[PDB]
Symmetry: C5
Subunit: 362 residues, 5 copies
């Protein structure tokens, strides 16, 4: 029969047994809370500053022994988002966050709900930037583990405990469509206990798995580099007396490999250690290097063959140097695809096992 605004200001009023900066059931057992996270948006995964940015709906539920009506018909009251300083809220902060802020749309995006027995539901909508460290030892086949973890600030484990929800603790809205990665539905929820000098502190931690697509990285920087290795292998099927043809093919294949590598370096992320891409670019450059050194090793012999033709022993080394040159051009014609196939097997095997392993440790 009375408006609730004229009642909610008398529970936490001046003449009432309520202090705003005090724990519920003080000098007693610790008051635990139940958390829930609803991600609206996800992305801007940047490797230079090593972070990402989210929009979450953090919802907390805790019990409080006072603030009970037991004589009113309305079972749920709502507190005004201006005077949030009147109620007690548990000190929560994100451990690995860079920057965070509230939302400033036409209403203050806050919500407080007090039930009959004294249960409090507190749901906000915030956006924030979480730091995550990334390792790119195997870049176009990597998986990434991006975690979050939320602490207390000055309250011990015997004073305030955090708890994940039992059913649907972390929910993700449908249709996110990351530009680089693919998020997985693992969502494993763990615990940490911050052991300090003062005492143990509570922690809970969510953990997302991201897998990188290699579709674009296959069509571009892999198929052209493979095709130009096969194009460098064309010089094993051309006769030796056509000297500027095989030289012009060899050096231009090296030029094609360099402009293929250096033309793509602006698109790749920038780190100071080796990746999986530049090992492939190094071996692909070393093959077009070796297909020209094989030609220089052949042409030196055929040139000093012609120098001895200018000078049966005079012409026995003629047919000896011809059979020597053709046996080099045959054993290179057979050997050069085979060691590259052996390297490509050992490459794709040593990368599939390592990426598979990086998923099992979580």
């Amino acid at each position: 029969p009375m408006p609730p605004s004229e009642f909610l200001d008398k529970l936490m009023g001046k003449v009432s047994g309520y202090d705003a900066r005090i724990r519920p059931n003080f000098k007693g057992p610790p008051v635990n809370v139940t958390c829930n996270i609803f991600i609206n948006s996800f992305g801007s995964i940047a490797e230079t500053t090593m972070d990402y940015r989210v929009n979450i709906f953090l919802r907390q539920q805790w019990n409080d022994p006072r603030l009970a009506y037991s004589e009113y018909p309305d079972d749920s009251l709502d507190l005004d988002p201006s005077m949030l300083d009147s109620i007690w809220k548990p000190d929560l902060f994100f451990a690995n966050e860079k920057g965070a802020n509230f939302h400033e749309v036409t209403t203050d995006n806050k919500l407080l709900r007090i039930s009959k027995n004294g249960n409090v539901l507190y749901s906000i909508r915030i956006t924030l930037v979480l730091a995550c460290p990334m390792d790119l030892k195997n870049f176009p086949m990597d998986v990434q583990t991006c975690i979050m973890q939320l602490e207390s600030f000055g309250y011990t484990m015997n004073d305030l405990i955090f708890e994940w929800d039992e059913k649907g603790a972390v929910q993700v809205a449908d249709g996110l469509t990351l530009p680089q990665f693919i998020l997985k539905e693992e969502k494993d929820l763990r615990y940490c206990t911050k052991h300090y000098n003062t005492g143990k502190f509570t922690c809970i931690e969510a953990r997302f798995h991201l897998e990188r697509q290699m579709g674009y990285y296959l069509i571009q920087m892999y198929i052209p580099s493979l095709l130009i290795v096969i194009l460098s292998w064309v010089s094993f099927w051309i006769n030796m007396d056509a000297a500027p043809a095989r030289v012009g093919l060899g050096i231009t294949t090296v030029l094609t490999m360099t402009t293929q590598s250096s033309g793509s370096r602006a698109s790749l992320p920038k780190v100071s250690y080796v990746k999986a891409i530049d090992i492939w670019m190094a071996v692909c450059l070393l093959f077009v290097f070796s297909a020209l050194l094989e030609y220089a090793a052949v042409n030196f012999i055929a040139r000093q063959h012609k120098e001895l033709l200018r000078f049966k022993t005079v012409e026995e080394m003629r047919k000896l140097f011809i059979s020597r040159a053709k046996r080099i051009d045959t054993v290179s014609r057979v050997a050069f695809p085979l060691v590259f196939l052996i390297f490509n097997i050992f490459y794709w095997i040593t990368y599939k096992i390592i990426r598979s392993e990086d998923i099992h440790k979580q």
Copy 2:
């Protein structure tokens, strides 16, 4: 006969039946509102963080049963934009927004208008960044659907309903001139009902259609790549004994295709899956690959023809290998334009149908 500032402070005064944080006609039917959106500016459509940014004029109109004069000549009162906290405003927020803010020009860009019967008009001017997910499976021919949707924050469907306006709900100022897309005058306005555990929540949603121009993407990265495929086809019209001419044309056409592809990768947007552009760059590289492998398959036969001329059966395989080489150079001279025309037909058909389909589902 009295100034309105000395009257408007007595409607929502202390000794008056008004509470600021209470619903109109409380414990009754839900108070619906009528919304209107006027876009001033539109752009900064970024794909990396998957959002865009607007400047809107959000105008709301709702009825309120109290706050009526019925005895004053002025039919329209104006409230001061400083003390907006005195009146009740419906809690509205954008569901898929990243960040939002008001405008801070010489006056506070707010407006409140109270009519005779109690109708309230509330018009603000805000700027904000809406998240939209983009799919670029067919990049230079794509259409994009960019939506917005606006919710309540804590009020149920039986407590607060949203409604689009009947005539001219969403208006767009003239002369916007996006740098990438072209906006269409569809402006289809739909509804959503957020079904949660607590209850149904109201929603209305605007929906814009953007179509990407392919004028620049046709002149650049399509016409040069086609012309250099025709330039690679010149090597089917040159005689076989000119070996370094056709080799120097073939490898330099491959070099031209690689520097055409890798030179343009900084201008394209960055994703990890395949697009429509690099399928064309893959087939265009595979054609200049195959026009050199056809030459290596011809020159191997003409070289072992000359090797048997160094060694009628001795010269029957001479004319056999010549007719074999010329029949390969003829069937490649006829086949290579035809399968490329068949591929270009199947390409433009499989992209026109998919883009047309992406418009019908809206």
Copy 3:
């Protein structure tokens, strides 16, 4: 004989006939104001988000019927920039602005001056980002019109009118030195009347003209492309039997044109429609395309000439095919500079007239 701070607080005091949120000479004729704009800095003209950023000194002058002394020696009073909320200020906002803010140097950059009769001078210093739409159909020869316009927010034309100053309304400080454009001293000042459902609203609008220099765009991407067209024309002066010389010149000229075009695409602004630069790059690529197709049309005839020399009628088509080839090499030697000169005349004429036209409409 008294300090003015102890007098200025009694004009707009509590017991005085002053209301802060009321119009001067209420229920009467509209109070007009006189505006003045002094630009300190100008630049950051960005095409991606389609805006620019200024630093202005907005100065307003209006009359007010009260607030007159008529008994004090000091003719000019100064109000403190903290308590600006005591006086009435006209609601002004920029219609096409993205974001705006004040200045927060050691003093609040505000100024209020009240004369004897009641004239008020109000001069602030603000910085703000105005949206402007740009059209780049003719990119390196374009002119741009960048306007600003300032409105009222909720006051009708019969309630508040805006007026430009008579002498020196818009002033520009000397030595601005834009990095891209050149500002002109046109400064044409117009009016708008915002016709809405509620009524007519006042507007005044400044309008700046910017002209883009083409000095860098002439030395780079025009002179090299022209010179390599003349370099492709060298292949009309070399004999036909030197086959790998003219082929190696032709394909490398095509390679030079592609690396000239794609090497410059990162420096150009990014739009989705055609510009004036890539039409020149398309015709310059089509010329080095046609100088190689002319060589393939010549070499096909001289090759089947040699094929008939392998096979007077046997040698009548010998001299017929030689006179046919030399007549093609002569008519291409004369035709290829002439149609390019005709195209370059029609190009520079169709661009000079369009740019000249874009200046006259203002």
Copy 4:
């Protein structure tokens, strides 16, 4: 014997002859101030938005006729940085600044010190972005003058005067290490008098000199371009009958000059007028253009020599065309280094004098 906080609030108390918004010795001579600037950090010199950013320690010293103790042992009092609004401070602002802000570390970075006679020392620590216009007509050899100037806001020259300090007015902390320029120890301090309609306003102006290093710009884009001009000059020492050798050297030298120029354009700053770098790139491209046109002028004569050998007068023009060709190849072999050395002398002289001149005007 009393705490100073209980005394400093009674000098500027309510019942005391102090007004906060009033000039010292009102209706009298103007109160001058003494300024000092200590730069902590310097950099982010950006040419696109034409500004730079500093961190200064602005310190002011002025006299005030009241606020004297003459009966206390402590000669220096300190005011709390929260209630800075109690004291009078002179209105100072930077004329050519884009944006400015205070510092928000654990304490408010403010300082107030009141001596015995009434001298006030006011020292803050602020960071701010000053606009400077840059002219890049001679880019890799330019000097830049970057000034700052600080005004009053509404106080006339007969009301408030600014003054530089006598010894050490502008100090610079050691070890700044700009990434592009080198700062010089000139630090010339001048005056301005802002003549307006209202009256003269005071100004003082600091002025820094920055000199750009050309060490990187010499090793890269100068030495390779010079070396490839000498590489194009190799074609004057090769015999004429080796046609595809000299053609393949000539066009590839042109290709090397284009990929040297266009490969470096992303590193250069972006303006619309000419610089010193692209004049060198234009003349270096015109030399490799002229070394190929000299070859086409030679090969046309030697080809029509061979055409007349196909047709003593028949063979008198044989030796005439041979002596004509060798005299062209000799006079080009001697002329081409000499006019390039004359151009390189006139180039380095016309740039050294202009850069030297740009230092003397300051």
Copy 5:
């Protein structure tokens, strides 16, 4: 038996001997503090604006002679992070910081703890951007020293002293994974005394060592440039009469060196002085320059050999010019690897000693 909030407001109450803006044990010995720094995150090391960004946990511990209970069971009290203005805090600021801010997660990230005797523990969590100057004279082998230092603001050394902690003053959380550098566990902690005109000011300074990995910089821009120098050395093993083969190898090796250098310039950081990378790119370009000038010096002699064969003295200079050419091709075949090996030894020695030296000075 009483709640601590009703006691903590009476220690620093109005009727109590506490002033907030006064030093503990005033007119006495200086109150020293003990500091501690815990870095959570580290990175965004940018060279253009010459700074980096951290997230620290600054913890201070000082004694205060008042504020003692000596009659309560709870030994540790906690102050509310809203009313931090009631207590005295020492004025601390970072000397070389660009910008700083607090954290605005659901609770104010502050902590105050008052022990029995009067010891105060004050622990905050802040993020801030420290300026550091970098020198890149030896870029891919450099070490960097990045310091921080924290001052007082207006308090003398005889009024406030800073002190590092004895055990674990600066701690670093595990698993940081910088994208460019590698942090070392040196953490040397020094002192500074700011000698000014007013007096000595206290300072303590932390100092981090960062070492740059050269793994990526070895695979890319070093191995390809070395391999193409060995590819340019192939032209010393090809006979002289194959003129367009060795010319086409030489100029294309120069083209490969230029597109290798200019293709990588976008990935390197931008400075105006020389580095270690472009000295290697200059010598690697000068080697492929000299391997073509050696060929022009050989081919000039063999061409004028053929010119004298067109004209025993007539043929004595034939064998003289042949033995002269082969002795040049032999002494270049032996000399060109040796002086490059001597240069590569003097290069790696002069860079290892300088980098080693830059570690010892700290």
